[PDB]
Design a protein around this ligand. Structure first.
Ligand code: CHL
Ligand code: CLA
Ligand code: CLA
Ligand code: CLA
Ligand code: CLA
Ligand code: CLA
Ligand code: CLA
Ligand code: CLA
Ligand SMILES: CC(/C=C/C=C(C)/C=C/[C@@]12O[C@]1(C)C[C@@H](O)CC2(C)C)=C\C=C\C=C(C)\C=C\C=C(C)\C=C\[C@@]12O[C@]1(C)C[C@@H](O)CC2(C)C
Ligand SMILES: CC(/C=C/C=C(C)/C=C/[C@@]12O[C@]1(C)C[C@@H](O)CC2(C)C)=C\C=C\C=C(C)\C=C\C=C(C)\C=C\[C@@]12O[C@]1(C)C[C@@H](O)CC2(C)C
Lengths: 196, 201, 41, 68, 149
């Protein structure tokens, strides 16, 4: 089992059965076993959403830079006009996300409670651990072994860090995310956080 | 028990039994009564002595070669004002990161010995040292001088510690000589040797 | 010595050290950002 | 009792040393000595931190401070 | 509410001018290069910058020429009371959580009263860092039911 700091004994409440475990808890936030489950689910959801956001706000910048397409940066996408008003799209989002989020919340409370379709009674998801619905959400039927879960959690943590870095990049420098990387490579020892 | 003491005819403290290398029973203030304090202070002294040997040789050797006429390097006091390819704060940050990894590994070794004796990424390579503060291994002890009869190890560690105390004193002396007289350390030595009686204050 | 550490951890000495550090810090901000009434951030 | 008296004597001597030193470095003693009647004695000076330097009045002799 | 901005307050300007005139009255008493004169010259600049900054932040002055604070919750005056309020609440919660967490740790000892006089510094240093996440910690502890005895 991995250790986040050699010479430091891991906390006892982290038995190592969970995926992506390294005994990292200096503040002891997961001392209560109940809090551990909620924190695990929150970490998973935040990781997935941050992964999607970082990918979707990094790739179009590269595509615009190379010359395949012409799309503005990630921060100024709000000024562009669309076929519907922003309030209308927000109303669609607010109604739409409520259903799925309440479904997930209901699963978190009672596992296996919402596995049955509410309109058509003959379709349902197979039993599984909470936070990994499986079934239709895994159309290719990949093996959900522990190694794949560890890979997912590691990528999620890296995505969280990357998103925070992107936000701080835009707040201070005021330039694009990929523009900064090219600026750093031109003169590595003269273009750094120290100068700015 | 019968080893030479710093103050002959006096009674050495009861927590200094002479087992440690370079022990002369000198602790009038009793700053190391507790065993943990003893171990921490021993590690601090060893690190200070090694850094002193590293620094002392880097101050007088360049100035000797400069005054003798071989090189032209500036004074050690003003070496922090010279031109460099990048701002000194960037160099400070890089140094901080590298020395941070090194000193963090060393700190992990002190608290829980034997916890950092294996290569994190190549488990084949290990370090063969057994005592804290003397890592050994191929990385640090290539010539095999760190292992042998206990008497030889004790004598070698004693001579290393004595050289370290001398180096620490010499480095502080160089600093104060240059703050006072306003010239290089070698110039002070030559001025003293020219007229030992009068060339002081 | 151990007694030196034990006497240094007693309530009055520790409280005085903490309050002195606190007062020094507060004077530092009051010197760095003098005559402050509103947050300009 | 003997040792307590010795400690009190030490404290008194420290107080006298402070009083004698402050009049040498932070005082207008010489200017007052050149004109005792029209100059107000002073031996204390305040740091300008929170606007408290208003206590440095014009006591005369080209000096600003608290009149003792 | 009948209040005018600082930048357009004739009484504010009069206060600034009067303070500067009073300060300059004592400057004429010393030689221009002297240390008291140098110290006095630094006071005038401080007053000028203070008045400029007060005018620049959109503070509201009444008929007196003195700024007033609006704490009703207006979005244009959140820096007066709302912004410093949350900071104070966070800091006070940090202090209270640290103090509460220290007492619980030593309550299980045989003589818990002895640790309230000779503070266990190695134990206290560990708890200090834990107060950074006090809002989350208290929110989670309230739901679980461990907040109240
Ligand atoms: C998370 C998140 C982040 C970091 C931002 C980023 C920003 N958005 Mg925003 N948004 C976010 C959620 C969303 N935005 C939008 C649609 C918009 C619009 C239309 C606008 C913003 C604007 C802004 C800025 C407001 C200050 C800020 C740079 C404003 C802006 O870009 O001004 C500088 C703006 O006009 N966002 C939607 C769809 C409903 C979101 C969900
Ligand atoms: C920082 C350097 C340093 C350190 C950590 C030590 C540490 C130690 N020495 Mg040591 N030593 C040093 C420098 C140092 N020495 C030097 C330069 C000399 C030559 C003069 C010696 C000569 C010496 C002898 C002869 C002996 C030791 C011994 C010991 C051990 C027991 C004493 C002890 O714990 O005191 C704690 C030591 C400290 C340095 C703690 C710091 C306390 C003071 C306050 C430091 C500041 C002093 C400074 C001059 C005051 C500045 C104020 C003002 C002038 C500005 C201990 C491991 C004894 C032993 O058994 O060795 C194994 C022993 O017999 N030392
Ligand atoms: C998650 C996530 C979210 C919230 C968004 C949101 C958005 N994307 Mg987007 N995107 C994502 C992932 C995501 N993307 C990924 C993973 C890829 C690959 C892309 C590739 C992509 C392109 C190529 C474009 C957008 C554009 C847009 C914006 C308008 C299009 C729209 O919403 O309809 C909108 C802000 C468009 C845009 O910014 O122009 C208005 C646009 O041209 N996205
Ligand atoms: C793995 C994530 C990641 C990566 C690859 C980068 C990469 C970069 N950052 Mg960066 N950054 C990150 C996370 C990251 N950052 C986070 C989380 C923050 C918030 C604290 C910042 C805040 C930040 C600032 C404020 C600036 C950069 C800048 C830069 C660029 C110059 C390198 C530098 O100064 O390093 C800076 C590295 C740090 C300050 C340490 C961040 C912690 C490390 C990355 C954790 C990961 C190991 C470089 C492309 C500079 C720039 O604009 O380039 C021109 C710049 O001014 N970064
Ligand atoms: C402060 C930064 C700094 C700088 C600019 C130098 C610069 C130099 N050192 Mg040096 N040195 C330093 C720190 C530094 N040192 C430290 C911290 C130690 C320990 C040493 C130990 C050291 C040794 C042992 C030697 C040098 C030598 C030299 C010179 C040869 C350059 C090559 O290599 C050069 C002028 C060499 C020389 O011949 O000096 C003229 C040499 O033999 N240095
Ligand atoms: C007078 C100077 C002096 C002397 C006599 C010694 C003597 C010794 N050192 Mg050593 N050392 C010195 C200066 C000195 N060192 C300095 C300045 C540094 C810092 C650069 C070190 C860093 C150092 C390390 C990191 C290690 C030693 C080790 C050793 C011991 C075996 C290695 C050896 O010498 O074989 C030559 C090789 C030996 C007692 C080793 C030891 O005791 O562990 C077995 C060890 O691991 N030394
Ligand atoms: C290795 C130790 C060492 C050595 C060899 C020297 C040597 C010298 N120092 Mg010196 N010095 C030292 C440490 C040392 N110092 C320290 C630690 C300080 C800070 C307190 C000073 C402060 C100092 C000043 C301010 C001046 C000198 C000067 C001098 C030179 C003239 C002699 C003199 O008046 O010194 C007097 C030395 C002292 C008052 C310090 C006491 C000696 C220390 C404690 C070491 C104790 C002796 C040592 C154990 C002997 C064994 C080593 C031996 C092989 C040399 C001479 C080359 C003068 C100069 O520039 O020459 C013109 C001068 O003005 N030194
Ligand atoms: C009981 C006697 C006594 C008292 C009441 C004071 C009181 C004062 N001294 Mg003082 N002083 C004393 C004895 C005393 N001193 C002695 C014996 C000496 C050495 C001869 C000094 C040397 C001294 C200096 C050098 C300075 C003061 C200063 C001050 C003032 C600021 C103190 C400060 O900032 O402390 C801060 C808190 C500390 C713990 C230190 C304050 C009015 C300062 C002053 O007036 O500057 C304008 C200043 O610079 N004192
Ligand atoms: C999810 C996430 C990001 C979501 C982003 C999305 C959707 C982006 C979307 C957009 O791009 C598109 C789509 C369009 C862009 O135009 C429009 C926007 C909207 C901009 C970030 C999480 C980001 C979360 C972060 C970074 C969290 C870091 C937390 C840390 C480190 C905790 C550390 C500790 O917790 C441990 C580690 C142990 C604890 O015991 C104690 C300590 C030590 C304290
Ligand atoms: C520790 C020290 C002094 C020691 C103090 C002593 C004796 C204390 C002794 C006692 O405690 C005992 C034992 C017992 C107690 O009961 C009593 C006292 C009396 C309290 C000296 C040096 C201590 C520290 C040293 C030696 C520092 C070294 C510095 C270096 C390496 C500098 C390197 C560079 O110079 C280069 C090479 C090139 C330049 O260009 C750049 C720079 C960076 C300047």
């Amino acid at each position: 089992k991995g250790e986040w700091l050699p010479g430091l004994a891991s906390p006892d409440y982290l038995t190592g059965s969970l995926a992506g475990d390294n005994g990292f808890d200096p503040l002891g936030l997961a001392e209560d076993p109940e809090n551990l489950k909620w924190f695990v689910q929150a970490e998973l959801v935040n990781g997935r959403w941050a992964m999607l956001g970082v990918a979707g706000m990094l790739l179009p910048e590269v595509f615009t830079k190379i010359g395949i397409i012409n799309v503005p940066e990630w921060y100024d996408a709000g000024k562009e006009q669309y076929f519907a008003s922003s309030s209308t799209l927000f109303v669609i989002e607010f109604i739409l996300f409520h259903y799925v989020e309440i479904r997930r919340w209901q699963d978190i409370k009672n596992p296996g409670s919402v596995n049955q379709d509410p309109i058509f009674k003959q379709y349902s998801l197979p039993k599984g651990e909470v936070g990994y619905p499986g079934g239709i959400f895994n159309p290719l039927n990949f093996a959900p072994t522990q190694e794949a879960k560890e890979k997912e959690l590691a990528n999620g943590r890296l995505a969280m860090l990357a998103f925070l870095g992107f936000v701080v990049q835009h707040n201070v420098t005021g330039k694009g995310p990929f523009e900064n990387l090219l600026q750093h490579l031109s003169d590595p020892w003269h273009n750094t956080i120290v100068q700015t | 028990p019968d080893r030479p003491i710093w103050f002959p005819g006096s009674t050495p403290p009861e927590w200094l039994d002479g087992s440690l290398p370079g022990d002369f029973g000198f602790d009038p203030l009793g700053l190391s009564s507790d065993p943990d304090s003893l171990k921490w202070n021993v590690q601090a002294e060893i690190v200070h002595c090694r850094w002193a040997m590293l620094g002392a040789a880097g101050i007088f050797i360049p100035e000797f070669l400069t005054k003798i006429g071989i090189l032209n390097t500036p004074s050690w006091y003003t070496a922090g004002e010279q031109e460099y390819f990048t701002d000194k704060t960037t160099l400070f940050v890089v140094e901080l990161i590298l020395i941070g990894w090194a000193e963090g590994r060393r700190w992990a070794d002190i608290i829980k010995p034997g916890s950092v004796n294996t290569d994190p990424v190549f488990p084949n390579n290990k370090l063969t040292g057994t005592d804290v503060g003397y890592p050994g291994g191929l990385w640090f002890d290539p010539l095999g001088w760190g292992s042998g009869s206990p008497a030889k190890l004790k004598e070698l560690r004693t001579k290393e510690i004595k050289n370290g105390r001398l180096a620490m004193l010499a480095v502080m002396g160089a600093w104060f000589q240059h703050i006072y007289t306003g010239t290089g350390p070698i110039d002070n030595l030559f001025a003293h040797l020219a007229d030992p009686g009068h060339a002081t204050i | 010595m151990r007694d030196l550490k034990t006497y240094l951890s007693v309530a009055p000495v520790l409280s005085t050290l903490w309050f002195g550090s606190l007062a020094g810090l507060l004077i530092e901000i009051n010197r760095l950002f003098p005559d402050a009434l509103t947050f300009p951030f | 009792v003997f040792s307590a008296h010795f400690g009190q004597l030490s404290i008194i001597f420290l107080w006298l040393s402070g009083m004698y030193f402050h009049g040498a470095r932070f005082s207008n003693y010489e200017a007052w000595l050149s004109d005792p009647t029209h100059i107000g004695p002073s031996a204390q000076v305040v740091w300008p931190i929170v606007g408290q330097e208003i206590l440095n009045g014009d006591v005369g002799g080209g000096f600003r401070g608290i009149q003792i | 509410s009948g209040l005018t901005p600082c930048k357009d307050s004739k009484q504010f300007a009069k206060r600034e001018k009067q303070q500067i005139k009073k300060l300059e009255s004592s400057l004429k008493l010393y030689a221009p290069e002297s240390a008291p004169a140098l110290a006095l010259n630094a006071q005038i600049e401080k007053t000028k910058r203070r008045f400029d900054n007060y005018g620049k932040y959109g503070l509201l002055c009444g008929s007196d020429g003195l700024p007033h604070l609006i704490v009703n919750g207006d979005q244009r005056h959140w820096g007066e009371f709302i912004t410093p309020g949350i900071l104070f609440l966070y800091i006070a919660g940090w202090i209270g959580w640290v103090g509460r967490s220290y007492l619980i740790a030593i309550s299980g000892e045989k003589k818990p009263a002895m640790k309230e006089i000779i503070i266990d510094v190695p134990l206290a240093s560990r708890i200090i860092f834990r107060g950074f996440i006090w809002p989350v910690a208290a929110y989670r502890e309230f739901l679980n039911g461990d907040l109240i005895a």
